[PDB]
Amino acid sequence: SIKTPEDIEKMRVAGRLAAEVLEMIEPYVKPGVSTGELDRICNDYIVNEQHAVSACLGYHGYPKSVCISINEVVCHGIPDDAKLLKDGDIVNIDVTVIKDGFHGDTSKMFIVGKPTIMGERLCRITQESLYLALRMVKPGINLREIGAAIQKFVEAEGFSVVREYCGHGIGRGFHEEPQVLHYDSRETNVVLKPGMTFTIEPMVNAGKKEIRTMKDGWTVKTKDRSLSAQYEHTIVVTDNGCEILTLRKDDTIPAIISH
Ligand SMILES: O=C(O)c1ccc(-c2ccccc2C(F)(F)F)o1
Ligand SMILES: [Mn+2]
Ligand SMILES: [Mn+2]
Ligand code: NA
Numbered sequence: 001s002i003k004t005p006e007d008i009e010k011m012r013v014a015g016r017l018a019a020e021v022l023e024m025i026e027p028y029v030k031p032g033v034s035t036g037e038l039d040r041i042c043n044d045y046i047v048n049e050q051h052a053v054s055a056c057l058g059y060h061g062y063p064k065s066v067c068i069s070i071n072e073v074v075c076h077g078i079p080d081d082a083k084l085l086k087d088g089d090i091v092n093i094d095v096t097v098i099k100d101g102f103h104g105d106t107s108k109m110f111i112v113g114k115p116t117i118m119g120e121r122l123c124r125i126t127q128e129s130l131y132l133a134l135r136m137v138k139p140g141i142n143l144r145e146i147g148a149a150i151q152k153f154v155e156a157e158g159f160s161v162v163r164e165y166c167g168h169g170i171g172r173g174f175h176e177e178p179q180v181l182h183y184d185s186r187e188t189n190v191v192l193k194p195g196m197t198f199t200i201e202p203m204v205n206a207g208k209k210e211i212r213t214m215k216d217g218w219t220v221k222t223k224d225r226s227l228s229a230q231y232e233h234t235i236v237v238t239d240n241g242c243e244i245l246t247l248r249k250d251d252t253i254p255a256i257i258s259h
Contacts, residue, residue: 002195003171008236010102011171011197015234015245017050018104021066021095023248029110031087035068039079042066042095052099055174062218067094067107071119074162074203074211074220074228087113090123092230096174103170105199106246107232118206119227125157126204126229129182131253133200137235137242138259141192146200148184154204162203162228164211164220169198170234192237197245201232 003011021042028041043065046052054065062076069077069092070085077092085091094107109123129150136146151161167180178190182202207226214221222228235242240259247255 001169001171001176002193003197003236004195007102007171008195008197010100011104011234011236012245014052014097014099014102014104015106016104017046017052017099018095018097018106018234019246019248020050021045021097022093022106022108023250025093026110029085029091029093029112031085031113033085034081035070035077035079035083035085035091036081038068038093039064039066042093046097050097050099052097055096055098055103059174068092069094069228069230071227072221072225074205074222075165075230076218076220078216078218085112088116088119089113090119090227090229094230094232101172103172103174103234104246105170105174105232105234107201107230108248109229109231122159122204122206122227122229125154125159126202127231129154129202129204130200130231130233133182133202134233134235134242134244134253135257137192137237137257138240139192139194139237142188143178143180143190143192144184144188147181147188150202151183154202160205160207160209162205162209162211165201165203167199167201167232169196171197194237194239196237197234199232199234201230203228203230
C-alpha cells in the first residue's frame, strides 16, 4: 500500500519514538544489567513518556515489550531478569512502538564493556549492510536487487545472512506486504514505489546461516553458536530515494537519502 502524506507523518512520529527508545536505553546497556530490567525500562519509557505502546507484547504471543538478543542469539531473545550482560557481549535491542495507529520498527547493536575486534567487526559490517541497502532505495528498483546487494556484501566479509527472517512493509500493521528479503531470491519481484514504507533488518551471522529455535518457542540462536548481529530501520520511499524514519543520533547515515 502507498501511505498518504498524512500517514507518512504519523510514521515519522512512530519511527522517531522507536529510535528514541534505543537512544534512551543506551546508558543502561552496561556490564551487570539484566535484559529483563532493560525491557522494563524500555516499556515504562514507551508507555509513560512516549504515550505509545509496544507492538511486540502479545504479537503472536510474544511475552515482552522489546526483543533483546545477545551474541549467538539471532533474534527474538526474551528479556529475562536473570540474564546479565557481560564484558565483550554484543546485544541487539529491537523496538517497535505503535503511536496513533502506526508502527515504528528499529533495532541496533550495543557492544558491552571492552569490545572484541570480532564483535565490533560483525556489528559494523551488519550495520554497513543495512546502510548500503538504504542507499539503494528509490522508485523503480526491485527489492531483489537490494536483497542481493546485502548478501553479496555480507558474504564477502565471510559472514552469512539469515534466511528465515526478513524486512517487511509496515504501517497500521506491524508486518505488512511486501516481504523484504536480505538475500537474493528468485521469488522476489517487487518494484519500489514512492510512499511505500517498509523495514530493512538483516540478521548477519559470523558463522553459518543455519539457526536453531530454543525450547521457549521464541529464542533463536545460530546453529553453530557463532555471533549474530542485526540492525533495523523503518523507511519511506521518496520520489528520489528514501527517508529513514527511525534514525538515531549515533547513526552515521543521513536521514534523507537523495539521488
Ligand atoms: O523487527 C521485526 O519485524 C520483529 C521483531 C520481532 C518480531 C516478531 C516476529 C514473529 C512473532 C513475534 C514477534 C515479536 F513479537 F517479537 F515482535 O518481528
Ligand atoms: Mn524490529
Ligand atoms: Mn521488523
Ligand atoms: Na546476536
